[PDB]
Amino acid sequence: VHLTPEEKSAVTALWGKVNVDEVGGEALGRLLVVYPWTQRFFESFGDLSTPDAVMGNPKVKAHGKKVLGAFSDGLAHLDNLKGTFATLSELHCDKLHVDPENFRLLGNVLVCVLAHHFGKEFTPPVQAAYQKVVAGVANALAHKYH
Amino acid sequence: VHLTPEEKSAVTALWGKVNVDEVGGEALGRLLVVYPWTQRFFESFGDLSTPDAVMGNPKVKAHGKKVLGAFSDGLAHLDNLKGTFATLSELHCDKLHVDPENFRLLGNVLVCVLAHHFGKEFTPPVQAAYQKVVAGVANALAHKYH
Amino acid sequence: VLSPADKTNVKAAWGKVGAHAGEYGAEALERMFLSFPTTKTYFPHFDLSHGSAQVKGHGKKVADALTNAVAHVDDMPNALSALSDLHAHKLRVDPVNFKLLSHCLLVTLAAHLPAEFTPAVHASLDKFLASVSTVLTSKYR
Amino acid sequence: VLSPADKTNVKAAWGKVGAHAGEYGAEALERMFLSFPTTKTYFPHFDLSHGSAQVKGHGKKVADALTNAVAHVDDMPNALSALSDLHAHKLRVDPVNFKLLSHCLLVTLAAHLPAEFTPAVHASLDKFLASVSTVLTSKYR
Ligand code: HEM
Numbered sequence: 001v002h003l004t005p006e007e008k009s010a011v012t013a014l015w016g017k018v019n020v021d022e023v024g025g026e027a028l029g030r031l032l033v034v035y036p037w038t039q040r041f042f043e044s045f046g047d048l049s050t051p052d053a054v055m056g057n058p059k060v061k062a063h064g065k066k067v068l069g070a071f072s073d074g075l076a077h078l079d080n081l082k083g084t085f086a087t088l089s090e091l092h093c094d095k096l097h098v099d100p101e102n103f104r105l106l107g108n109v110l111v112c113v114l115a116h117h118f119g120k121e122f123t124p125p126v127q128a129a130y131q132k133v134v135a136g137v138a139n140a141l142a143h144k145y146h
Numbered sequence: 147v148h149l150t151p152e153e154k155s156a157v158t159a160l161w162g163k164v165n166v167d168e169v170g171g172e173a174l175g176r177l178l179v180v181y182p183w184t185q186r187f188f189e190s191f192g193d194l195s196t197p198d199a200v201m202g203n204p205k206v207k208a209h210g211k212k213v214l215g216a217f218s219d220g221l222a223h224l225d226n227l228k229g230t231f232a233t234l235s236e237l238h239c240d241k242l243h244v245d246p247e248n249f250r251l252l253g254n255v256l257v258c259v260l261a262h263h264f265g266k267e268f269t270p271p272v273q274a275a276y277q278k279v280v281a282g283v284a285n286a287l288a289h290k291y292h
Numbered sequence: 293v294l295s296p297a298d299k300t301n302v303k304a305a306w307g308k309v310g311a312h313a314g315e316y317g318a319e320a321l322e323r324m325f326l327s328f329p330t331t332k333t334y335f336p337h338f339d340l341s342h343g344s345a346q347v348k349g350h351g352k353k354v355a356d357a358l359t360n361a362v363a364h365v366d367d368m369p370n371a372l373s374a375l376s377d378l379h380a381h382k383l384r385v386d387p388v389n390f391k392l393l394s395h396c397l398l399v400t401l402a403a404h405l406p407a408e409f410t411p412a413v414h415a416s417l418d419k420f421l422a423s424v425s426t427v428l429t430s431k432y433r
Numbered sequence: 434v435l436s437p438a439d440k441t442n443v444k445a446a447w448g449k450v451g452a453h454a455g456e457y458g459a460e461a462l463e464r465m466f467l468s469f470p471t472t473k474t475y476f477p478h479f480d481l482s483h484g485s486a487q488v489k490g491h492g493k494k495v496a497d498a499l500t501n502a503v504a505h506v507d508d509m510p511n512a513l514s515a516l517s518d519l520h521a522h523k524l525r526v527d528p529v530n531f532k533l534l535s536h537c538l539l540v541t542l543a544a545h546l547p548a549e550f551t552p553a554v555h556a557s558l559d560k561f562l563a564s565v566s567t568v569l570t571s572k573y574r
């Protein structure tokens with residue numbers, strides 16, 4: 001993805017302040033609460049019947065950490081998202097059977113979580129840069145689908 | 147886009163049988179009838195009150211021939227759609243103010259027109275090849291939006 | 293909102309379909325799988341090879357459900373109740389996928405109804421599929 | 434369908450927006466133009482720079498409409514009938530854009546309500562915005 005120096009700067013600056021563990025768990029949790037159909041991939045995670053159950057589920061927080069961690073690594077290769085996520089793309093298609101539409105929903109929830117967490121610091125321009133980034137990541141993860 | 151040689155030939159073979167002016171008028175008329183909000187750019191075309199009015203309108207036909215002629219010429223540069231449509235991309239954004247969603251709607255209507263026109267010859271595989279082409283053209287026309 | 297005229301159009305086109313509802317239903321799925329491969333993520337357990345009994349059988353179930361909807365065009369929520377539950381709570385198919393199948397059913401009808409697929413009918417069928425899609429995704433959350 | 438809990442959630446959250454409704458509507462528009470540039474094609478007649486009084490004025494109108502929607506949560510189609518007519522027949526904004534504006538409204542709300550923007554409340558507002566989008570696109574065809 002092509003980001004202007006300004007968009008790149010914005011992205012990196014904010015990311016330095018993110019507690020990947022915490023933010024990862026919140027983002028995955030909100031995905032499961034706001035778009036309940038996404039729970040279809042987590043049957044073995046236990047109790048997901050209520051918002052409090054989802055948010056406080058250790059398997060959810062654990063997975064969230066994992067996902068945002070991989071996401072994190074992607075920020076370091078904004079110039080080559082496809083090549084960076086090719087292996088995971090294939091895994092998600094071939095082994096996990098995940099509809100890439102889910103990457104898009106996660107992207108939007110992440111933006112909501114960033115806004116919630118950072119408040120006024122998540123300005124319109126910053127949002128716009130993250131929107132390009134989450135779009136990019138989603139595309140990269142869907143690239144090896146067949 | 148990237149089509150396999152088999153797909154490129156499938157697209158090419160069928161296109162040689164198309165009356166570009168006829169299909170053009172028909173695709174544009176059908177866009178205006180099935181998604182009436184698309185009529186917003188053609189208020190100067192005259193009577194668009196009913197389906198018959200739309201389909202028989204000389205300006206709709208004229209515009210349809212224009213759009214599909216461009217599309218047609220585009221099929222000769224499948225290897226370079228972004229480059230082929232860059233200038234048109236810019237025009238549609240800067241001067242015409244056309245939501246790129248319209249390109250996607252037209253692509254789907256074109257696919258329906260080809261199916262209606264060709265019946266059994268428009269097989270699943272041929273459809274898939276056209277789908278990649280219409281998504282390719284729509285992407286190319288949307289590329290220079292800002 | 294399906295106008296009176298829409299309903300008339302849909303009933304006329306579907307009648308035409310008649311006995312091929314099953315065959316048409318299989319072809320629409322096959323067109324989907326090919327055109328939009330991400331939809332295959334919902335059928336990992338299926339034999340998706342051209343003309344598989346699985347796809348033929350499923351195409352028939354899909355066609356029957358649509359016939360039911362035409363029959364009960366005025367009471368769709370009621371008519372498709374069990375199916376919306378299935379899709380929403382059991383299958384949990386992302387709603388975006390409904391547009392893809394709808395487009396593929398529209399292409400299949402166009403390919404098979406040369407006399408009947410007029411611009412007016414095409415509009416009514418598109419609205420009908422959107423309406424069915426709306427019902428099927430109304431209990432998701 | 435908005436549950437009794439969803440209605441309660443939406444009234445609490447909108448209640449807290451209070452007098453800031455208009456500023457938030459402006460911010461949401463600005464977030465939309467920046468993040469989804471194609472939405473600018475509907476406002477070629479507007480000065481879209483940051484701080485634009487036109488954007489602010491328009492944001493206040495949008496916010497006021499949402500206020501009216503919350504006040505009439507069980508009678509939305511009637512309360513928003515003029516707006517549905519307007520968007521459907523005069524403005525003719527492609528339906529796809531409604532999800533974009535909804536998202537930017539969600540983002541704005543999250544940035545302003547640290548306390549109230551709970552997972553539960555987030556789901557209720559998402560549902561509420563989809564319900565409003567539904568009403569506004571109901572007369573398109
Ligand atoms: C026009 C919209 C649709 C209609 C009318 C429809 C209808 C049906 C019917 C009648 C069944 C069989 C239920 C039974 O056996 O009791 C079914 C099952 C199913 N549908 Fe749909 N469906 C639609 C959209 C979708 C979409 C968009 C997808 C995914 C892309 C999907 C995926 C499935 C799956 C995975 C099953 C279960 C198949 C199995 O395991 O046998 N459906 N649907």
Ligand code: HEM
Nearest residue numbers: 472475476494495498499516524526530531534565566569
């Ligand atoms: C939550 C959904 C929406 C709400 C509540 C809403 C509300 C409104 C209101 C209250 C007005 C002013 C009506 C008047 O002049 O009496 C308006 C006008 C307008 N809306 Fe929306 N709207 C929504 C979605 C959209 C979207 C998604 C777009 C395009 C991306 C859009 C584009 C416009 C335009 C272009 C105007 C006319 C502005 C002018 O030139 O004065 N609306 N809308």
